[PDB]
Design a protein around this ligand. Structure first.
Ligand SMILES: CCCCCCCCCCC(CCCCCCCCCC)(CO[C@H]1O[C@@H](CO)[C@H](O[C@@H]2O[C@@H](CO)[C@H](O)[C@@H](O)[C@@H]2O)[C@@H](O)[C@@H]1O)CO[C@H]1O[C@@H](CO)[C@H](O[C@@H]2O[C@@H](CO)[C@H](O)[C@@H](O)[C@@H]2O)[C@@H](O)[C@H]1O
Ligand SMILES: CCCCCCCCCCC(CCCCCCCCCC)(CO[C@H]1O[C@@H](CO)[C@H](O[C@@H]2O[C@@H](CO)[C@H](O)[C@@H](O)[C@@H]2O)[C@@H](O)[C@@H]1O)CO[C@H]1O[C@@H](CO)[C@H](O[C@@H]2O[C@@H](CO)[C@H](O)[C@@H](O)[C@@H]2O)[C@@H](O)[C@H]1O
Ligand SMILES: CCCCCCCCCCC(CCCCCCCCCC)(CO[C@H]1O[C@@H](CO)[C@H](O[C@@H]2O[C@@H](CO)[C@H](O)[C@@H](O)[C@@H]2O)[C@@H](O)[C@@H]1O)CO[C@H]1O[C@@H](CO)[C@H](O[C@@H]2O[C@@H](CO)[C@H](O)[C@@H](O)[C@@H]2O)[C@@H](O)[C@H]1O
Ligand SMILES: CCCCCCCCCCC(CCCCCCCCCC)(CO[C@H]1O[C@@H](CO)[C@H](O[C@@H]2O[C@@H](CO)[C@H](O)[C@@H](O)[C@@H]2O)[C@@H](O)[C@@H]1O)CO[C@H]1O[C@@H](CO)[C@H](O[C@@H]2O[C@@H](CO)[C@H](O)[C@@H](O)[C@@H]2O)[C@@H](O)[C@H]1O
Ligand SMILES: CCCCCCCCCCCCCCCC(=O)OC[C@H](COP(=O)(O)OCCN)OC(=O)CCCCCCCCCCCCCCC
Ligand SMILES: CCCCCCCCCCCCCCCC(=O)OC[C@H](COP(=O)(O)OCCN)OC(=O)CCCCCCCCCCCCCCC
Lengths: 288, 116, 116, 288, 288, 116, 288, 116
C-alpha cells in the first residue's frame, strides 16, 4: 500500500519528546525508551494500516510525549463492522511482537534480563489501553455494543455517563493508593479533558450522523424495523429514535387507531427540503 | 507488588468532529461533479464547511436560545447556500456560505420574535 | 515573629468601567429590537460606546474647561447619535457618534465664547 | 447545564505563572504550590459562581503571579443585595476548605505536618483579604456600608480618602519597619496603582449611575424619601444628593415659599431627552 | 525633560532576566538582585539624561541578563566635548549613591550588614567598568585622548590593537586564577564579540566621519593646521590625514618647491561632486 | 581575598554603525526641506540609507576586489541617487536608490575591466 | 586578513546541539563536553583552513549533534594534490593537541585525572575517523589511492563496493554482538544513508568530471599515455577509460590496421560543441 | 573491555554535487565577462544549473530509457540554451534552459521512435 508508506514517511513528533529523549540519553534509560517507542509505534501503525485499507480519511500520525495517536476524520458515519475492525487491529497485534521477542530470546540474540522488560512493558501497555474509558480502546468497543442495542443518542449519553463514573473511580483509586507516579496524573488529566471536549459537540455529531443517513449510498442494505409513534410529537423528537445500521419504517398513530405507514425517505426530504424544521407531523400525511 | 512502576502510556485513534478546510483544485472538482450530479460530492462539500456554522452559532450567543435549533437552522442555511451557489459572480464560496448562514438565521429570528 | 513566612496574595473582583466593544452580530440585533421597541437595547448601545468619549474629551483638553461639563455633553451627544442613527447610508456607528459628539462640544464651545 | 461550562471556558493564566510553577517544581517547593493554587482558585470560583447566578457580564478569571482576579463589567449598576451577595462569597469558602482538610487529615491521608501549613496559609489569606483597602474585600464592604447611609458621591469620595490613608500607613510600615519582605512590596505597589487608576475615573462612574437610574422601568420601586432644594444651586447640585435605591420627590422653593413636589422622572427627562440642561429649577418650573 | 520621562517609560527587558528573577525569588537572593538592578539602572539613566540634554538620537534603553545598555545612534560625528561629557556622566554619579546609602545607614533605616553589601557592589561595579577595554568606559575615554593626539584612522587602529592586547591579558589572568565564576567568562566572550563586530565596520565609520565633515555646520570654528603633502599621492590617501576637531589647510609640494595652498572645501567638493574618487591630485590645482 | 565574589556586570553606551531605517512622514518632510534647501536634512537622508550600501556591497563579493573602493563607489551612487531623485514617477525612494547604486557599481566595474 | 573572518562568519549550530549542551550543563557532564567540542572544532578548522587556502567554495561549517561537518561544492573537480592536502589536514591536528595538553598538564594547570580523559577521547576519535568507509577519512584516502592506478569509473565503482561490504560487516557486528551502544547505531545509520545517497548519484559526478576535463586551458599538462580502441564499442566506452590528470592519445583501428593518433580535444569538441554524438569513431574518422 | 565508554563521533568533508543557485548579481557579471570573453564564466554558468536537468530527467521517467542517455542529452540541451541566451527579451534564464532541454529530449525521443 503506497498510502501506508506515505503515512509512515510523514510522522510528526512533539517538541517535548526530543527533550525527553535528550534527558534519557544523558542519564542511561535508553533501553526502556526504545522499547516503549517501538511498542507504541507498531500499535499505531496497525491502526493506520487497517484505516487505509477501508479508504478512510487519515490526516496525520502523531507522537505525543505520553504516547501516540492517529488523527482520523470519521465520526458516526460508517458501518459498524469497519469501526470494529479498525479498533480491534491494535490489541490483536501484540501477539506477534511477543512471539518475535520470545524467538529472539531463545536464539540468544538478546540477554535474559532484556527479554523480561519487553514482556512486562508490552503486557502492561495492552492491559492499560484495554480499559473501558472513552476514548482509549475499551470505551470505543463498548460504544459499538451500546449502539447495536440502543439508538444513537441514548447510546452516546449512556457511554458518556459510564465513562465519567469510571474516570472518577480511577481518580479516587490513584489518590488513595499512589499519589506519586506522575504518569497516572497525566493520564487522568488527559482523560478528563478529552471527555469534556467530546461532550461539547454532541449536537454536531448527531447532525453529521443524520446528514450521512440522508445521502445513503445503500451500503449492504439491512432489515427493516417499524416504529410505533403517534401523530402528536415533534419531527425532531422522533428523528432521535433511529438505530444504527438498520432501516426504520414509520407507523403513524392518530387517536388509538393508526393512520398509515411512512418511510424515512419522505420525512427526511420534508425536513431537509421544505425548511420545516420543528413544526409538526400531523400534516406530513398530506404535506401540500 | 509491581504497581510501583507501570508507566501509563496511551494509544488510540482520534475522531475529529469538524474536518479541516479543503483546498481549491479538488473543491472545484467537487463543484463540477455536483453540477454533473452526485450526492457523495455534495456530502463532502457540506461536511467540510461545518466550521463556519460552528463559528456563526458561537458568536450568536448572549441571547438565551438553546443551541439545538440554532445548529439545525445553520445546517439548513449551509445546505441551501451550497445547493444554490452561483460561480458566475466571481467570489469565494466561503463568504457566500457565511452570508447565507447569516441571512437564514436572521430570517428565522424575525419569525421567532414575531411569534414571541 | 510569625512574619517572613506570610505570602500575602490577593483576590478581588475588579469592576470595569467601559464595556468591551460589541462584535459584528449583536449590534444589528439590538438595533432591530430597538426598532420594534426595546429601551434595554438603547441602554446597552449607549453603554458599550462610552470608550470613544474618553479619548474625545482628552483630545479637547488643555483649553481651560472642567471635565464634568465636557463628559456630560459628550454623553448627551452619544445619545444624539444613538437615537438618530440611519445605518442604511453605508457607514459605521463609531464615526457617526464621534462626529456628533465633537459637533456638540464645538457648539458648546461656540456658545460659551459668544456668552463670554 | 451550559452556563457553568461556558464559565469554565473563560479561565486564563498569566505567562509568568507558568515559569513560576516550572521553577518551583524543580527546586522542591511542591507541598505549598498546590495549596496556594487551590485556595486561590476556590476563593475566585465562589465569586464567579454567584456572579453567574445573578446574570452578570463576566470577562475573564485571569490568574496573576501574585494572586487571582475575576473581571466583570458592572460598576455602580446592580442593586445593593446583588453586590453584597457577590462580595461575601469570597471569605466563606475557607470554612468548608478547613473542614474538608481536617476531615481528610483525621483519617490519615495527609501527614500532620502538611495539615499545619495548609491551615496557616488558609487563615493568612483569609485575614489579608479582609483589610479595609480598595479594592480588596474589606473596602467594598465599607463602601456598601457608606452607600446605605450617605449620598452616592459622598460615599465614593470618603471611601477613596479612607483607603488612601490606610494604604499610606501600610506603605510607611512596610518600607521603614519590616526588613524587606518582597511579598509585601508587590501588594503595596499594586494597591497604590489601583487606587490611582480608580481615582482618575471618578466621573464616568457617576454618569453610568445616572444613566442606569434613568433607564429603570418600575424596577421594584422602594422606600420614598422626599428632598428639598433652594433657588441658588443648579440642577447638578440637586442630582448629586441622590441615594442608591431610593426615589426622591423634590420640593421647589420659590425664595421661602414652596410650590409643590417635583417628580424625579421629569427632571431626568428634561436633563437627557428634552435637552434642557445648563439651567436652574426656576426654568424647570416654567418649561415649554 | 519630557523626553527623559518618555525614555524611562519604555525600558525594554530581555526574557532571560525574568527567569533569573524567578530563580532568585524561589531561593532567597533577592536583596543582592535589587541592589544590582538599582545600581545598573541609575548608572544607565545618567547616560540617558546627559545624552538627551545634548539632543542626540537615542533609540532604546536595554536591560541585558548581565547589565544594561543605552543604544545611541551617533558614531564619530560629534565634537569631542560632548562625547566626553556623555561618557563621564556614569562614573561621576556613584558618589551620590554612596552618600545617600551612608546617610540612610546612619539614620538607622537599614541595618549594618546591608550597608556593607551595597558599598561593596557599588565600588566593585565602578572599578570593573573603569577598565580600559572597548567598549566599556575606559576604552571610550582613551580613544578620545588618542583622537586628540592622532588622526582619526590611526587612533582607531591603535585603540583596537591596545584593546585586543588587554583582552588577551585579562583572558589569561582569568584562566590561570579563577576558571570558575561564570560571570568572568561571560564578560570575556562579550568583549571578544563586541571587538570583532566593531572591527568589521571601520570603513563605514570612516565614511560617516567624512560625510559629517563635508556638511560642516561650523560648530565653534577652531584653529587651522597646515599639511605638508606632495602632489604625487592619491587623494584618498591624503584624506586619511585629518585631525578631529580641527581645520587642515593643504600645502601642495611639487618637486621640492611647493606650488600653492589648498583648502579642504575645494578638494572635498572635487571628491564628492566631480566623481573623481581615486585618480590623482596633480591636476587639482587646475581641475577643468 | 574577596576575589571569589565579584559579579562582573557591564554598563556602557552602544554606538550603532548604521541607523535603523526611517518612517514616511518625516522622510517626506526631509525631502520637502531639501527641495527648500538644507544640508542637514540631506545629511540625515544620506546616512539613514547606508544599510542598502552595505547589502549591495556585500552581495557583490566573490570578485577579488577590495572593499574600500567598492564602499566609496556605493556611497557616491547613493548620494547621486538622493540628489537626483524625482518624486513624479511614483515609486519608492529605496528602490530608486538601490537601482542607482547598482548602476554606478556596474559602470565602475565596466570601466575597471576596460582599463585592466 | 579578511578571508579568515569571512570563514568565521560561516559556522552554524544545529538546534538539537543547544538542547544537548543545556541538559549536559545541569546534569554534571561538563568536563567532557568541552573536550569533545574543542576536538571536533579543531579537527574541522583544519579542513576549513586548507580548503580556503586552495580557493575552494565553502558553504558551511555545520555542527551536528553527533559530530561536525564542513560542506564544499567540488566533487571530482580539483587535482589529486589539492584533495590529498585537504583530506590529510584532519588527522594531523591531534598531534599538536596532545602535545599542548601534555605541556599544560606538566605545569599542573589541569589535574591528572582530567588529562587521561582528554587523551582517551583524542585517540578514540582519531582512530574512529580513519576507518575505510565512505565518506569518513579512510575511505577518501582509499579512493585517492585507487584513482592513481585505475580509470575513474572503475575507481568509483570498486570504492562503492568495498565501503558497502565494510559497512555491512560493521552493522552486523554492532547489532548482533555488542550490547546496545546507542552511540554506534547512529554511526551505522548515518553511514548507510550516506552510502545510499552517494550510490543514487553516480552519473552526475561523471558528467561533471567530463565537463571539467573539457574546459581545461593548458591546466598544467602532464604525463602522456596513448590508448588504443576497437571498432566495436562506441565513443562512450572510449570515454569511460580515462584516468585523472592524464592526456590520452587514441589510436584508430580500422579492423586490424591503425590509421593514426586521435586527439582528445577534438573528440570532446565533437561530443559537446559539434554535437556529433550517438556515433562510433568510424564516423569520427570521416567528419564534415 | 574498553567499550561502553567510547563515544564514536565523526568528521568528514561532504563534497556536494549540485552548486547552490546563483544570486541576482553574479549572473549578469558572468554574462558580461562571457560577452567580453571568458570560458570560466561559461563553465560556472553550466555548472550552477544541474538541478534543472536533475528534476527534468526524473520527470521523464517510467518510459523505458537508461539514465545515462537522458542525462547526456539534457546536458547537451543545457549547453544549447546557455550558449544562445538573449536576455534582452525579458525572461529568466531558468525557464529558457528548461524549455531548451525538454525540447532537445523531445527531439531525441522522436528520433528514437522514428528509428525503432
Ligand atoms: C558535538 C559534540 C557532541 C557531544 C555530546 C555531549 C557529550 C556528553 C557525553 C555524555 C556521555 C556519553 C553520551 C554519548 C552520546 C553522543 C551520541 C550523540 C547521539 C545524538 C542522538 C559521556 O559521559 C562520560 O563523561 C565523563 C565526565 O564526567 C565521565 O567519565 C569519566 O571517566 C573517568 C576517567 O578518568 C574520569 O576520571 C571521570 O571524570 C569521569 O568518571 C562519565 O560522565 C562518562 O564517562 C554519558 O555517558 C553515559 O554512559 C552510560 C553508560 O553506557 C551511563 O548509563 C548509566 O550509567 C549508570 C550511572 O547512572 C546507571 O546506573 C546505569 O543505569 C546506566 O547504564 C550514563 O550514566 C552516562 O554516563
Ligand atoms: C513516547 C515514549 C514516552 C516514554 C517516556 C519516558 C520513558 C522512559 C522511562 C524512564 C524511567 C521510568 C519513569 C517514567 C516517568 C516519566 C513518565 C512520562 C510522562 C511524560 C510527562 C525508567 O524506568 C525503568 O528503566 C529501566 C532502565 O534499565 C530500569 O529497569 C531495570 O531494567 C533491568 C535492569 O536489570 C531489569 O530487568 C529491571 O528489573 C529493572 O527494573 C528501571 O530504571 C525502570 O524499570 C525512569 O526511572 C524512574 O525510576 C527511579 C530510578 O530508577 C527514579 O526514582 C528516583 O530515585 C532517586 C535517586 O536518584 C531520585 O532522587 C528521585 O528523584 C526519584 O525517586 C525515578 O525518578 C525515575 O528515574
Ligand atoms: C497564584 C499562586 C502563586 C504561588 C507562587 C509560588 C508559591 C511558591 C512559595 C515559595 C516561598 C515564598 C515565595 C513567595 C513569592 C510570591 C510573591 C509573588 C511575587 C511575584 C513577583 C514559600 O516557601 C515555603 O514553602 C514551604 C513548603 O516547602 C516550606 O515551609 C514549610 O514550613 C513547615 C511548617 O510546617 C513545613 O512543615 C515544611 O514542609 C516546610 O519547611 C518552605 O519552603 C517555605 O516556608 C519560598 O520561601 C522563601 O522564603 C525565604 C525567606 O524569606 C527563603 O530565603 C532564604 O532562606 C534560606 C534557605 O536557603 C537561605 O539560607 C537564606 O539565605 C534566604 O533567606 C527562601 O529559601 C524561600 O524558602
Ligand atoms: C541585571 C541584574 C543581573 C543580576 C544577576 C544575578 C545577581 C544575583 C547574585 C546571586 C549570587 C551571586 C552569584 C552570581 C552568578 C550569576 C552571574 C550572572 C551572569 C548571567 C549569565 C549571590 O551572591 C551574594 O548573595 C548574597 C545574598 O545575601 C550573599 O551575601 C551575603 O549577604 C550578607 C548576609 O550576611 C553579608 O553581609 C555578606 O557578607 C554575605 O556575602 C551571598 O550569597 C553572596 O554575597 C549567587 O550566590 C552564589 O554563591 C554561592 C551561594 O552563596 C553558590 O555556591 C554554591 O554552593 C553550593 C551549595 O549549594 C552549591 O552546591 C554549588 O552549586 C555552588 O558552589 C553559588 O552557586 C551562587 O549561589
Ligand atoms: C532615588 C533612588 C534611591 C537611591 C538611594 C536609595 C537606596 C540607597 C541604598 C539603600 C540600600 C539599597 C536598597 C535595596 C534593597 C535593600 O537592600 O534593602 C531594603 C531596605 C531594608 O532594610 P534592612 O532589611 O537592611 O533593615 C530593616 C530595618 N528596618 O529597605 C530600604 O532600603 C527601602 C528603600 C528606602 C525607602 C525610601 C525610598 C527612597 C527614598 C529616597 C531616598 C533618599 C533620597 C536622598 C535623601 C536626601
Ligand atoms: C519489525 C520490528 C521488529 C519487531 C521485533 C524486534 C524487537 C523484538 C524485541 C527485542 C527487544 C527490543 C529491542 C529494543 C532495544 C533493546 O532492548 O535491546 C537491543 C538488543 C540488545 O540486546 P542485549 O543488550 O540485551 O544483549 C546483547 C547480546 N548480544 O539488540 C536488539 O535487539 C537489536 C534488534 C534486533 C536486530 C534485528 C532487527 C530486527 C530484525 C527482524 C526481527 C525478526 C522479525 C521476525 C523474524 C521471524
Amino acid at each position: 500500500m503506497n498510502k501506508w508508506l506515505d503515512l509512515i514517511l510523514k510522522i510528526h513528533v512533539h517538541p517535548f519528546l526530543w527533550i525527553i529523549a535528550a534527558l534519557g540519553l544523558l542519564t542511561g534509560h535508553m533501553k526502556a525508551l526504545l522499547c516503549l517507542l517501538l511498542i507504541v509505534l507498531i500499535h499505531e501503525l496497525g491502526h493506520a494500516a487497517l484505516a487505509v485499507f477501508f479508504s478512510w480519511r487519515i490526516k496525520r500520525v502523531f507522537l505525543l510525549p505520553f504516547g501516540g495517536t492517529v488523527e482520523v476524520e470519521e465520526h458516526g458515519n460508517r458501518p459498524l463492522k469497519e469501526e470494529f475492525a479498525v479498533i480491534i487491529a491494535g490489541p490483536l497485534q501484540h501477539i506477534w511482537l511477543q512471539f518475535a521477542a520470545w524467538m529472539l530470546a531463545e536464539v540468544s540474540v538478546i540477554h535474559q534480563h532484556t527479554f523480561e522488560l519487553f514482556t512486562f512493558y508490552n503486557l502492561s501497555i495492552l492491559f492499560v489501553n484495554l480499559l473501558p474509558i472513552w476514548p482509549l480502546d475499551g470505551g470505543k468497543l463498548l460504544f459499538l455494543l451500546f449502539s447495536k442495542q440502543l439508538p444513537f443518542q441514548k447510546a452516546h449519553r449512556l457511554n458518556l455517563k459510564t465513562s465519567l463514573c469510571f474516570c472518577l473511580l480511577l481518580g479516587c483509586w490513584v489518590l488513595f493508593v499512589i499519589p506519586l507516579q506522575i504518569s497516572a496524573w497525566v493520564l487522568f488529566v488527559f482523560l478528563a479533558v478529552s471527555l469534556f471536549e467530546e461532550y461539547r459537540q454532541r449536537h454536531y455529531i448527531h447532525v453529521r450522523f443524520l446528514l450521512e443517513r440522508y445521502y445513503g449510498k445503500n451500503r449492504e442494505l439491512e432489515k427493516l424495523l417499524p416504529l410505533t409513534v403517534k401523530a402528536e410529537d415533534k419531527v425532531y423528537h422522533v428523528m432521535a429514535e433511529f438505530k444504527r445500521g438498520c432501516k426504520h419504517p414509520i407507523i403513524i398513530e392518530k387517536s388509538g387507531q393508526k393512520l398509515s405507514q411512512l418511510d424515512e425517505n419522505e420525512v427526511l426530504h420534508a425536513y431537509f427540503a421544505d425548511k420545516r424544521t420543528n413544526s409538526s407531523m400531523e400534516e406530513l400525511l398530506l404535506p401540500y | 507488588f509491581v504497581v510501583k512502576e507501570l508507566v501509563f502510556l496511551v494509544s488510540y485513534v482520534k475522531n475529529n468532529a469538524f474536518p479541516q478546510p479543503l483546498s481549491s483544485s479538488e473543491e472545484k472538482k467537487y463543484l463540477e461533479l455536483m453540477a454533473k450530479g452526485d450526492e457523495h460530492a455534495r456530502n463532502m462539500l457540506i461536511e467540510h464547511n461545518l466550521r463556519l456554522v460552528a463559528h456563526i452559532v458561537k458568536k450568536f450567543e448572549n441571547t438565551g436560545e438553546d443551541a439545538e435549533d440554532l445548529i439545525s437552522i445553520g445546517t439548513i442555511g449551509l445546505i441551501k447556500g451550497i445547493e444554490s451557489y452561483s460561480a458566475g459572480k466571481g467570489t469565494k464560496l466561503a463568504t457566500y456560505a457565511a452570508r447565507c448562514i447569516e441571512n437564514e438565521i436572521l430570517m428565522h429570528l424575525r419569525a421567532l420574535k414575531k411569534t414571541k
